[PDB]
Each structure stands twice: as C-alpha cells, then as structure tokens.
Design a protein around this ligand. Structure first.
Ligand SMILES: Cc1cn2c(-c3cnn(CC(=O)Nc4cc[nH+]cc4F)c3)c[nH+]c2c(Nc2cc(C[N@@H+]3CCC[C@@H](C)C3)ns2)n1
Length: 249
C-alpha cells in the first residue's frame, strides 16, 4: 500500500544494527513519523528475515499507549521500510546517558508503564524477550513506549535464555528488574567487560547495590532477579508493590 514517494525524509534519528531510522512526513496527511530503513542484505545475510516479518505482524496489531505503534511497511530493491510512530522525546538509552541515573519517581513510573504494556502483551501470548533501554522510547508526555517485538548483548537476558533452557513470559519480568536496577544505578546489575564475564554473572545471579538504593527498590529488584522464574512476581504484584505505589505517578 505504501511507497517511499508518499513520504518526505527528515534528519536521521538513529543508526541501528541493520540500518538507520529517519524522521519522515507523509506528503498528503503531513503526519510525522519514524521511518526504519533496514538493508535487505544485512538482514538476510544474518538469517534475521523471519523476525522482521514477525515484528511486522506483531507490532501492527499491537495497539497500546505504551507500545510504539506500526502503521505499515514496504521494500524496494536494496532496502526494507517499517513505518512507525515517532517518539518526540527520543530513547530512554540517550536520556540515561544524559541524566546518568534516574530518580525513584521516574523509575517507578517507567516500570509501571512497562508493566501495563507487558500485561497487555502477555494476553495475546506476546513475550518481548528483548527489553533494553535502546528499545524504550518516550512519547510527547515523557511516557514510555516499547519498540521492536520481532524477538547480541546478554545484559537483560535471564539464565533460562542464555543457558538454552525453557522460557516463559517470566523472561520479561527479569528484564524489568535489570531495567529497574539500571535506571537507578546507571549501569545494569550484571554489566561486565566480556560476554563470558557477563554470562557467569547472570548465571550465578551475582549483583550488588550501591548505598543509595532504597530498601523498597532493593526489594523489588531482588524479587525480580531470581534464577527460578516461578519465584519472580507477576506484573499485578509489581504494579501493587509499595515502592512503586509510593514513588509512581
Ligand atoms: C533513535 C530514534 C528512534 N526512534 C523510533 C524508533 C523506531 N523504531 N525504533 C526501534 C529501532 O529503530 N530499532 C532498530 C533499528 C535498526 N536495527 C535494529 C533495530 F532493532 C525506534 C521512534 N522514534 C525514534 C527516535 N526519536 C527521536 C526523537 C528525538 C528528539 N530529541 C529528544 C531528546 C533531545 C533532542 C536530541 C531531541 N531524537 S531521537 N529516535
């Protein structure tokens, strides 16, 4: 249905592992959006193709306020184009580089917004499995918006995923705890200088808190960062946690 001709391309917003995402404007409507321009080569040469058709069919039917909407797609001779919602306030990754760390109030609200989005996702049996600051964006109101559902650093992946074992929706609960720690501390709990140092830290669940981390934050992260998935809470408990209710908005 769509074609490059129907849009006016703007500045590059960011370069990713398969191509770049540009600011764009559909000519007739004047609708501002994000144009993820990915190379057919870089994608197909790494056997990724199947995940992009997934991202297409998942992100398009996925309608929620905290989920980057996908309006459509197309593919010319050399490249592949996904027409996406534009997050005026950019990535959470960039915000965290600017601020270094986020306060208890900004963290709680992001976990809440992630939790509500993931709660909606776990209904259609949609598990993200790849939540990380780079895939978390910010709408006009500074509200969190998740991108890239088609699915590499180990940081946010739980033991089950890395060890090649059976995984559930509980994978995203763990990622929420790696994020909650990261947003408050400024680095993820298992951050190491090698894949193998990280693989060991995640496997043995070896992480520490700086002095400033609140007891309620120490609690939630510790509840979420459990090796056995069953022992992790579920989203309705995260949303009802005393640290989240006290500090969220
Ligand atoms: C980078 C980027 C991406 N955007 C998306 C988007 C769409 N898809 N995805 C996922 C994806 O591209 N993934 C991906 C790409 C390639 N290969 C593998 C992959 F997995 C993110 C939507 N909106 C944006 C966006 N908006 C911005 C606003 C401002 C405005 N800014 C605010 C702060 C202060 C100042 C600088 C002004 N800056 S950036 N930025």
């Amino acid at each position: 249905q769509w074609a490059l001709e129907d849009f006016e391309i703007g500045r590059p917003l960011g370069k990713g592992k398969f191509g770049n995402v540009y600011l764009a404007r559909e000519k007739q409507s004047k609708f501002i959006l994000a144009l993820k321009v990915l190379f057919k080569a870089q994608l197909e040469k790494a056997g990724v193709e199947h995940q992009l058709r997934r991202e297409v069919e998942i992100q398009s039917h996925l309608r929620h306020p905290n989920i980057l909407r996908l309006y459509g797609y197309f593919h010319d001779a050399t490249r592949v184009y996904l027409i996406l919602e534009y997050a005026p306030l950019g990535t959470v990754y960039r915000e965290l580089q600017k601020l270094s760390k986020f306060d208890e109030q900004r963290t709680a609200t992001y976990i809440t917004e992630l939790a509500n989005a993931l709660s909606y996702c776990h209904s259609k049996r949609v598990i993200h499995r790849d939540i990380k600051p780079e895939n978390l964006l910010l709408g006009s109101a500074g509200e969190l918006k998740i991108a890239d559902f088609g699915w590499g650093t180990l940081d946010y992946l739980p033991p089950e995923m890395i060890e090649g074992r059976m995984h559930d929706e509980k994978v995203d609960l763990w990622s929420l705890g790696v994020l909650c720690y990261e947003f408050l501390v400024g680095k993820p709990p298992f951050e190491a200088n090698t894949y193998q140092e990280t693989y060991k830290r995640i496997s043995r669940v070896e992480f520490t808190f700086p002095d400033f981390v609140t007891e309620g934050a120490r609690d939630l992260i510790s509840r979420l960062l459990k090796h056995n998935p069953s022992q992790r809470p579920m989203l309705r408990e995260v949303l009802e946690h005393p640290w989240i209710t006290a500090n969220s908005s």
